[PDB]
Amino acid sequence: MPLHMIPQVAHAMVRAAAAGRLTLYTRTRTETTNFDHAEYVTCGRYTICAFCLTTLAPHANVKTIQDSHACSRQPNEAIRSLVEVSDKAQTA
Amino acid sequence: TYNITGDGNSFTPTSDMTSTAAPAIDLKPGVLNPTGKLWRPVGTSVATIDSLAIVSDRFGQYSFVNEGMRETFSKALFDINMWQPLFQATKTGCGPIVLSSFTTTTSGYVGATAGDALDNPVTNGVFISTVQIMNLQRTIAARMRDVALWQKHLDTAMTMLTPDISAGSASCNWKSLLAFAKDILPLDNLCLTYPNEFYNVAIHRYPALKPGNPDTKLPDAQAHPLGEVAGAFNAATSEVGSLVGSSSTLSQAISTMAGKDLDLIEADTPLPVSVFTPSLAPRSYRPAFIKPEDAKWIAEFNNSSLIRKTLTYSGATYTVQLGPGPTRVIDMNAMIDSVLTLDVSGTILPYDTNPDLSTSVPAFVLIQTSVPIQQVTTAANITAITVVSAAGASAINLAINVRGQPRFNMLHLQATFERETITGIPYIYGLGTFLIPSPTSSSNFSNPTLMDGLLTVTPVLLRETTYKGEVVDAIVPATVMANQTSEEVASALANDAIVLVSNHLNKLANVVGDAIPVASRTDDSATSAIVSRLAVQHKLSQVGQASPTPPDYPLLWRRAKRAASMFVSNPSLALQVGIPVLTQSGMLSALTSGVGTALRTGSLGKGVTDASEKLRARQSLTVAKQAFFDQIGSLWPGK
Amino acid sequence: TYNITGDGNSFTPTSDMTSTAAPAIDLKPGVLNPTGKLWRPVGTSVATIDSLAIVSDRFGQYSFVNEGMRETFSKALFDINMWQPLFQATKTGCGPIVLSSFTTTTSGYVGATAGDALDNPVTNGVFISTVQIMNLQRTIAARMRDVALWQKHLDTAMTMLTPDISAGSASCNWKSLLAFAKDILPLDNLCLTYPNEFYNVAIHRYPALKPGNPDTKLPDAQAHPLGEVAGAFNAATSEVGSLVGSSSTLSQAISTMAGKDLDLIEADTPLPVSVFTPSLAPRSYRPAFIKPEDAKWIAEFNNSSLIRKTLTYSGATYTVQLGPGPTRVIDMNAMIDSVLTLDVSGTILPYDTNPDLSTSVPAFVLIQTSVPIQQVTTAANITAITVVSAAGASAINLAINVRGQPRFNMLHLQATFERETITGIPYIYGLGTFLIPSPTSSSNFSNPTLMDGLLTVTPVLLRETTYKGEVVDAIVPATVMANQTSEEVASALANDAIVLVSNHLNKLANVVGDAIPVASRTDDSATSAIVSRLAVQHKLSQVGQASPTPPDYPLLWRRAKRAASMFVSNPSLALQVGIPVLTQSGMLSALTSGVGTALRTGSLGKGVTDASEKLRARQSLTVAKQAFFDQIGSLWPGK
Amino acid sequence: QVGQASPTPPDYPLLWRRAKRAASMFVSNPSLALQVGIPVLTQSGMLSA
Secondary structure (H helix, E strand, C coil): CCCCCHHHHHHHHHHHHHCCCCCCECCCCCCCCCCCCCCEEEECCEEECCCCCCECCCCCCCHHHHHHHHHHCHHHHHHHHHHHHHCCCCCC | CCCCCCCCCCECCEHHHCCCCCCCCCCCHHHHCCCCEEEEECCCCCCHHHCEEECCCCCCCCCCCCHHHHHHHHHHHHHHHCCHHHHHHCCCCCCCCCHHHCCEEEEEEEECCHHHHCCCEEEEEEECCHHHHHHHHHHHHHHHHHHHHHHHHHHHHHHHCCCCCCCCECCCCHHHHHHHHHHHCCCCCHHHHCHHHHHHHHHHHCCCECCCCCCCCCCCCCCCCCCHHHHHHHCCCCCCCCHHHHHHHHHHHHHHHHHHCCHHHCCCCCCEHHHHCCCCCCEEECCCCCCCCCCCCEECCCCCCCEEEEEEECCEEEEEEECCCCCCEECCCCCCCCEEEEEEEEECCCCCCCCCCCCCEEEEEEEECCCCHHHCCCHHHHCCEEEEECCCCCCCCCECHHHCCCEEEEEEEEECCCHHHHCCCCCEEEEEEEECCCCCCCCCCCCCCCCCCEEEEECCCCCCCEECCECCCECCHHHHCCCCCHHHHHHCCCCEHHHHHHHHHHHHHHHHHHHCCCCCCCCCHHHHHHHHHHHHHCCCCCCCCCCCCCCHHHHHHHHHHHHHHHHHHCHHHHCCCCCCCCCCHHHHHHHHHHHHHHHHCCCCCCCHHHHHHHHHHHHHHHHHHHHHHHHHHHHCCCC | CCCCCCCCCCECCEHHHCCCCCCCCCCCHHHHCCCCEEEEECCCCCCHHHCEEECCCCCCCCCCCCHHHHHHHHHHHHHHHCCHHHHHHCCCCCCCCCHHHCCEEEEEEEECCHHHHCCCEEEEEEECCHHHHHHHHHHHHHHHHHHHHHHHHHHHHHHHCCCCCCCCECCCCHHHHHHHHHHHCCCCCHHHHCHHHHHHHHHHHCCCECCCCCCCCCCCCCCCCCCHHHHHHHCCCCCCCCHHHHHHHHHHHHHHHHHHCCHHHCCCCCCEHHHHCCCCCCEEECCCCCCCCCCCCEECCCCCCCEEEEEEECCEEEEEEECCCCCCEECCCCCCCCEEEEEEEEECCCCCCCCCCCCCEEEEEEEECCCCHHHCCCHHHHCCEEEEECCCCCCCCCECHHHCCCEEEEEEEEECCCHHHHCCCCCEEEEEEEECCCCCCCCCCCCCCCCCCEEEEECCCCCCCEECCECCCECCHHHHCCCCCHHHHHHCCCCEHHHHHHHHHHHHHHHHHHHCCCCCCCCCHHHHHHHHHHHHHCCCCCCCCCCCCCCHHHHHHHHHHHHHHHHHHCHHHHCCCCCCCCCCHHHHHHHHHHHHHHHHCCCCCCCHHHHHHHHHHHHHHHHHHHHHHHHHHHHCCCC | CCCCCCCCCCHHHHHHHHHHHHHHHHHHCHHHHCCCCCCCCCCHHHHHC
């Protein structure tokens, strides 16, 4: 799984983010809590990889850019978490 | 050359004179050779026979020239020659090549290998150089590309009122034709600039056509160029349509027999997959109303148990609700390697009356347990329920819901069924279902589940085709016989003996229909192969008065056309249980073999019926063409 | 031989030098002959001319040898010779055969028959013996099977970094390539044991490749073996891609035209079934929403009557309930011979609200009455209601019932429709229905019946194809024209003129697309045949000022591409009512005939567009190959 | 890379087997060539080859 129809499946990803439940899983650790670029975000079978923004495999062994891929979706991460939060516990 | 705009010119299209040119020639590699490269006894006198060095490849002296290739090639040059006056006028390097000049003397030893060549010396023959052929070809190609506009233009004319009477003979005022041509034809044509040339050429190619008025005395002739020869072979005879035709046709049939290698069918005991199997395609099966009894890889769980509430996701629940005919259990326990292409559309059928309408998806779940399905009564049993196939596993109203409809949008699901992933042992199952996170009311939605669409097995692993659930390196046609119900066949994986055999069998049929006159009720001697097997088989002798069967020859013969005809009409019947006499593989072996001999030494089969009919239709065609031309004569009686 | 592991060796793959060997040769029977067996005047002196006996077939002196076969065969021997050093080293009987030794003197009379042979004596030529050819072949076959491993191995190399530039020229460090090969290649290869031989051979086959360092002075040459010749013909020219290609292509088109025998289309008045019809397949039709008006063999009973309760079994009852659109009435009154393959799935639709849910089956019932359907108002009328098609005629919930669904399992029903069974007279009907033994409440289940699935007619009797309900020994294409609606076509039995014609017409189309440049908007002179018919037909003359049509040549020409294109895009349109200009069979006859001439004398059609494009693509390919090799150069700059 | 690059025991077993697999997939359905996300056939080079 190399990603196809990129902007759309991206769409979908983000829709999971927007409704809090996004499977944000880097190798061993279940959520990309800290900014350690995910490996498996289940976009209806499409395992999204934050490592490359693409899927399954990282772009390089340059953990700086790879994390940067991650950092890029700082909006996605933040929204996901945030929506979870609000839809659980928030501003009294 | 003669003024085209003259009188005396015949417009006689005849069968005898069927247009032809030289459109393309044979250039098969095999065919290029003949043969021996030319060599020398080192270079010293007649002593060194033991040793040869090839002549001067350097810039000249090569091999003994291909007799056929020379002859062919010279012919090719003659095509261009057909337009010589025109080339010349176009100033386009017209000068007729004279191939012969290229074909230069080679003198010494002839052979393929030094080996062979040592033995044979051939004094003062001919070679051609790589270089030379390079430059020769170059010229010819160039010539062709110069004519490419001309050819087209010539063609247009020849169709714009087509001089082609394939059958018999037509005649009409050429003048009339010609003048209407020039009254109707587009100005932008090369034909209108070059009338005189085009016509000349035409005349030179089409013996069917005569010059204007050159000597109005004698505008017409019976001797034309070479053409003629080739034409006689395309012209319809007393007993056959086309000689080339029937010859070609039959030869295509042979060669397909050749490629099949016959033997294929007469295989009981292991014939290797790779050998028997060509190229394979995916197939499409249903859950729905498939039959557990028949369907090896796809059976069902049985009513009564009830495995209702199962956790599906993180603290999220769906009632798989296992009881009365819950979709199907896809038995992918070492059933080759496939991709479970689930193609859901239509079917959604919203939960009974649950506000769990949103969050419910068409999904695939594989079940991975050492507890055989019939034992699976509680949650404990399952081992593994793995939801494989859902993607975004929530929901949206993809159903055409506006007008009340519960049509679900077309989904494409994938489950990479690689048996290596699991390697057996916790035997492999899968189910189909509208799976939810959002908890479903078990009491409410009493239906187990009704996710009924398509399941398009992708048999990826063209390696090692299955004989009836048996993953074998063997394809055994003759034993497949009478061991398959229609249901079974339908059910069967793509990767399975049955379809492969039919594909091969379809080529046999093809042959039979085109070549042997098994068309509308023609019982021919050709059909004798099957009857001879039948005749000997019927030797039902008892004591006293044995079977009083008035000899096989009418009786069985007619029965055997009938069953041939049934084979022909649908090839699969061969594989289908309970077919009177084809159930006997002997007869199919007999047919298979039989045909080839029948092609081989058949005295070129031309059905009497069809002859007469073709004759008649042909004539009537010509009539109406005449009448057309007549109308053209009427509307512009050109000069 | 030279050390392979040296410097100077070129890696120059060129179009000029396209790999080739001799993979297979022509061995057509026809081709085996040339010709005359050798005979003798009894055996006494020159007197007995009247009488000939064949020479000594016994153990020798046979026929005058096939010139072509000799030439061919010797070539074949040369293949083996290409590996002589290797054979020799393998100790595998290497010794080059020398075919010539086998070709032994025959001296006397030459002819096919005693007849013919009497006339012709040919002194001191050559024969070959049955025995001899036996043993010769034996050797060659053996040679081949000894090389079978080698060939493969050779091939692998040649693909594992493929030296094949089909277009133009590539170059890269052979050294580099070679060393990466030997750094990457599997150890178990024969190539790694036999480097020196394989390379030598390679070099001997692939003029595209040069030896190592043999004289680093001169490692390279321009003269290679014979190869070359055949290569030039596969190499792309100025105006054409491949010479062989286009030649072959066109010839395949011809021969398909040949086999069709053209004439086929120009048939008004009886052309015999057998002749026109090849091989036939079953088709699939629906009850459902088919149209009684159009569908010859399948119409409906009309709302208003009500034949509700009919005894079905022994003291057992079903309401057939005959009224508002009761499924369909299958009109199998002498409608050739078929097998009514009823394929029911989905449809069960349980009785309204009857506890007659169990015992209700999907069935077929034939109705056998001399009372025409519209007269059939009470039970009295029926004559015969025979329930034919149900098998176990009770029921079980085969419907996917769990989730509310009334999906009925896939059933296969059969009704052997053999009109001979009845032979007309009580005209033949049939219906479809959920038939019960267990009595159904007429008041309740007011619906007549709704057994709506598939009906796959199996037209078994490939004997005598039907022209539009008319069971005739005739297939008449030209009259079929404009007498068929889309509906009718769809409806029509498998055994019917229409589809047969299209099948033939599809081969015409195939030809046209591949050979004639009727691709994206290219109006070619070739298209002239249709226009010429159009042009003459348009002679709509009145009084005074007739039709002021600016000559046909732009006008009609463009209209006629349009409609050609429509034919090409869907062949069936030819048979479909209301098609502007194709409705005129004349134009289809014109096209049909027209094409053949167009192939015949066409100056090998190479679309200018496509040429340039192929050129460009080809170049860019080569570029990227270069770049690949480059990368390979980078990663292991082999020596 | 730098230092220890990809330690791939030569292509010849490895990639060879992978490549039969994907050939076989091509053969079994030709359309896969056009279909996104196919491991190694996605590279048009190999299809040209």
